[model samples]
Target: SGFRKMAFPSGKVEGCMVQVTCGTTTLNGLWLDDVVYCPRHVICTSEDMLNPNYEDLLIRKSNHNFLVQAGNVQLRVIGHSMQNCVLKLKVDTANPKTPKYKFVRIQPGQTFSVLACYNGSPSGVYQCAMRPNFTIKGSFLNGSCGSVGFNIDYDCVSFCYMHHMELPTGVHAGTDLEGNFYGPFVDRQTAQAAGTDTTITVNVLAWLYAAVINGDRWFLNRFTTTLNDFNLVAMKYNYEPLTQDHVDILGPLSAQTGIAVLDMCASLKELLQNGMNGRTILGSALLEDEFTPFDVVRQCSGVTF
Candidate 1:
């Protein structure tokens, strides 16, 4: 059947507006800074991507499109998925381009994010729900080989969203998250303020739990990155040059002609069958706007590529 029961599984719990399963994990305890955001945190130079010696590592289908990969070294919520409703990704930017490739695997400690919108509602923040049927695939990043995380990290893969969060005793004192953050960018004061949260914004928030999706990807902090990472995350989308045309034209427009969300998950689960060597591949990612309707797979027309 095309539907999955929305009721929480026996092995799972709920937190931050998401599913928390026995296999789930969170940053509540030893939340190590050890976790890296694939291509965003990886070091990949232009020459690095062009190295023929590492030709196989470059997962490019063409010149502008490719895949990205991440690992879940610790978290372990298997058989679960997450769908986040982002503030920026609306109807206009919905249906981010999907990768030619399918599936995003989360190894023992790797991670990957996709555009989603099923249960992100009913809250103040972008809540990533456990809706396996609504997740959409994203593109990979650009980087060189040999690096722990590269190539798969695409522009905008990293993102952060914040609302009316302010700080105390800070430089901008007595302000909310709105002061410094305007649009694609915000100043340091506002960034830190929102980062600090209404109260918990100061840090020390617990992850409640973690979940897995597609296959190996154990997701944590599905809640957008913290306030301190607000500006930094938004900048990832801001800096990426919007030159994607081929992907738009090639992606699916309607659900009937596209990959079923259930099947998409299945494909990914099978694709990463314990093969990604260094957990640094950009297999697929959460593209432009990490949210969407049930059908929009790609831009139907008005594309220039």
Candidate 2:
């Protein structure tokens, strides 16, 4: 076997708007915190801070991308033959050299999910949605991985035509999503505002009926996305590889790919599974940004070579 079990510690990853220069097309002087991945995918906002008709501008701030760890876990791949497979991966969210997350030994016949906090509104003040998805094999597949957000409506959908259809149509196809689905980061300020009191009844009758009928995961994923998460969910399949060329190219692009959206529900689900092992892992913050430099497991085969 060319592979051996590896261990790590669970830590958190944060999203930030990094600055850059593009020769003749310098954008806003700096990129939004999490707007790096593919700014072209963000749904443009209607207005800007100084301008009123900022229509067609990016919407959400730095709240896209997800944080992951390097370890073994089971994930669902896209192909019908590849629904869910257990594989070892070096989950690095650090943009630039690894702008697009990496997956090693991924089962060719399974589906996996990555998630993040999108459209996160002010805590105790506004309710936002949580979007999750993964782009692999040239297509994005949707599935439900439980969310740990309060007042969060997990509702991830496809990036809109404005961002998805009109891009350069390559790895950056959904980059506009980074611009459109913006919001606050996971911090005391946001948590405090979102955790505020709510009076909207959760429709007890409707909830009970639905529970008895057993709604499917596809439906649940959609419902959660609509009720709590703002209408923003995007996915793209392996737009690139993890070779030397990709490493060099993505390494510098890391700063720019921060704001784009990715997936994390699968990570969330994996977190819970790890917790069940008495493993106190990183906070959900790791799942909130494009670049993460944290570990999530302690010991995997324990053979110090």
Candidate 3:
């Protein structure tokens, strides 16, 4: 199938009215009023505006110095004064409902840091603040900082959402469609030692991006109709009505960074049996290393590409 255009009201809404629609069947939107919806799918809650003012906090205790160190994944509160101090830290992530709080006792010249998430996958949007404890002489100087962003410590491959794998360990050897010679290096080390030209590397990345996105499109096309039918069948059993458990289950699945090809194959089998072809499937020993557009082209039949 080709793309079918669906129109929505244009312009900004502080909160969105979410409507789910298929053909003429309309499911009304979900709206949360009073929240400023930012561009690019960001929703700001009330807590977003409550960051502590570090400057004011420091000013109140001018007798001592306070320091804050922040990074993509961590934030440190340093008590630089000569006096023992108590500090309260509050951290908020992309979700406002689950803010984190910490109370730290830092002796003079001591530092305390907060790590919001460090599980090795993508994570975080923490706005944290440090203020004097309730017993401190001066009024609590709430010191707040910017959002803490973090991700896996690896180069991400677009579309695939996977870590960049080792580029052929041996000397990179290849030519592009434009006939550029890559290299004659003996190994990856040689290639790096020789300060190899990037012409081939860039081309590889370019092609790889295209290929991966194309692969995603293909996979989506293959499953869209099947998934819709499955949804209909499941809904007939009253499974379409989502509960908190469904939201809880979706949370982890959305956080997953990558899917192994083997895992995908297993999922494909389920899709085939339950929705697609109603049959079992298996991987083959042989694989195609190269193919042209003509070899892959077929009549496109599916939903929104």
Candidate 4:
């Protein structure tokens, strides 16, 4: 998409005269469709300049915060014949009094695209969006058109939607606010020397993110002791995702993260059926003494959700 400006005469109105012919009429409102017919008092102006104010020009950002306990996350922007749009990502501060967020710009891609923001222990509102600023240089053709903006508004979950698992060593399936059992290997840890299990727990988190990225919760719950398995495998969180009237508020996720390999594990069952375990997808794993922290590439794909 190059610009939002429109050429005149070619983008004309059919019934424009019918409305404009009326004497001193005031058509003070919004008009859509290919053509807009304004009244007499409401004179018709030329299309907006190459750049104009947009409703979404850096105003009214998201306020809702989230805590992605254990999951993978990504976002993409859809361009409708428009040039590359700027997407800004922000992380809300822990304290509301000091509100701030990190920003990033996302450009168009061969496929859908988005900036990736990973948080293993995330506890804030993370947002990716675009906004227009108000710098009135061009003359107002007729009516004013500026201050437009857009943002992604999906309440997406990374690994699994519900928290329904308990670790093998009695660690609560998802989150543990109690702050007990501070070790990686639950079977080989005492309260006094629980530091050794840190790597194990982090490794568990990495795999969990991968599985969730692929929408594979069967193995995800297998590592837990609790029977409360989230219906992740049953829930299609991948390509061509279907929406359920009852449960699906936000839609499925794309599997094309920078580290996304199998593309949402489209044939995960077949891939595993033909092999063993220990294959890394979406992110890399360097077994140097212990698993190195991996970064999942955040790519964008177009979809309603």
Candidate 5:
């Protein structure tokens, strides 16, 4: 187990955008809050004014790069003097503090991704960050371990395209989805403002139904496969390296709901197994300016609000 676990208090904190600079490019929107993900070719700090540990956490502001302690960890930014950017990290424990630290770095034209996984409670939000001058392009995977949800990987282009195509007419998109007024909304905000009802569950079902009614089975099959893939990962909570208590809480849910959660998963699985003929129906429409491909396995792993 070369991986080290850094534990932090669990609770959502207001996060702020971090600024990062590379060769000649500068980027923003690097989040420093619960489940953070950022792109490469940028630099930012974790000095969010609203973060609960703001005063306790210290990072470079204007003078120079510095290391500071926050909560139970000590962190610093390194490699800048060499014209390379790197993050040096270490956790403080009572047994004995060590000089060793974890490092995350990348070269130009590459992406860096990191996540904070919390234990001890069903869920808790902890402050995490990426090295200065880094960026992760596009959507990535976001999944829940225990009760904590985190994003994984970086830059999903295909998923982005699928999302773009599924919009407007997709279940998750459109501002006004009525019985007769089903629309491919411009975006979620508009859809929420205009639609009578648009929930994740409702949207999923509607999306599926729309695919069926439209006779476009490619998306139906692919999306269903995506669901099945998510189901497999969701059901393996207690598979190994953990106790029975780690099992997915869905077991009881299955009993109370009559349909085993996995059984419902099987429904989708079986439907996909039946095999449908046709290319994907979604993604025919694309705006070159808006349709940058990216990854987001965790974001689309299940329902995202």
Candidate 6:
């Protein structure tokens, strides 16, 4: 068994399953090093090839905008790693109100692919990532902590038709709709295309950007440990993210614009009310602020790069 069983519902997955057609629809998960070009919906897989030290790395996020059809896709990669896996593919092939996303790379034993379109058919979003060299500067130092990254929010057109009405597909990120698009943010997602599917089983070990003085604790990437008593969660736009109930509305009003992704807690219950002030997390009124670090490395793991 050199490994090749595919289809897992367990916890942390790893390896090949590839099979994503489009225009007629057909999808299959799991993938590590590319193959089967012309990606229609999206693809990626890895938590640590064959293990060596990765105690538990869940939430590998691999969204594939579904249903909405049209074709001309492209995205391939087939190179297993032993240490040498750096990929970042963001394609829209230019011209979409001139929004923006451009970068492509591959390495870990050959083969890399990219090419997506919008003004030419199989349109918008082909975002694949492998967070390396990730910098928020000197990140969580202890020898550069937090690592084990992946996010393949591929969408060659799951929704967003220009000619036939329903429009709102500027490619992705900072809250753009998800799968089967229909308009006015047809159920917007893209905080790394968000959870469900490739999720569960934990052991993140590191992730910080803390702040809470006078009550104790302040970790702005100075990374510390030996702590507990956590509670400060959110993620609700199509249900189920758990942990909310402090009253006064929540999920950063479903974490606007960046479309939510938080766990920021270690205990610091109250911090100014009545028109809001200090340590804000869901203070809606149709909130819209900005800070995109792939929405915190798509929720933990990647303290730096």
* Candidate 5 to native Cα RMSD, angstroms: 19.1
TM-score of 5: 0.24
Arrange candidates, best lDDT first: 5, 3, 6, 4, 1, 2
lDDT of 1 at 81: 14
Q: Could you give candidate 5's per-residue lDDT for residues 1-305 as a string of tens digits? A: 11112222222211222233333222321123221122211222322211223122223332133222223343333322211112211212221321122212222111122222221112233212211111112222221211112222222110001111122223321011011112322311222222332112211222233333334443322232244464454344211121122124333433433443334444434443443344332332210111100111111222222
- Which prediction has the highest lDDT against the true structure? 5
Note the clash tally of each candidate: 35, 85, 8, 22, 35, 8
- Candidate 2 TM-score, true structure as reference: 0.17
**How close is each model in CA RMSD to the real structure?**
24.3, 22.2, 24.3, 24.0, 19.1, 19.9
Residue 54 C-alpha lDDT in model 1: 23
| Alpha carbon deviation, residue 121, candidate 2 (Å) | 9.0
Q: What ranges in model 3 sit over 4 Å off? A: 1-56, 62-147, 150-305
201-276 per-residue lDDT for model 3 (tens digits) = 1111122222333442222223222334444543453222223333333232223324332233333333334553
- Stretches off by above 4 angstroms in model 4 are 1-170, 173-266, 276-279, 283-305
Please give, for residues 138-181, the per-residue lDDT of candidate 4 as tens digits: 21212221111112223221111001122333332111111111
Residue 85 displacement (Å), model 5: 7.4
Deviation in Å, model 3, residue 17 alpha carbon: 39
> Model 1 segments beyond 4 Å from truth?
1-186, 189-254, 272-298, 303-305
What lDDT would candidate 3 get against the real structure? 0.21
Candidate 2, position 136, lDDT: 19
Query: Candidate 2: global Cα-lDDT?
Result: 0.19
For model 1, residues 80-191, the per-residue Cα lDDT tens digits are: 1111110110111111232222112221111122122112111111122211221111221211101111012222221221121123322211101112232222212223
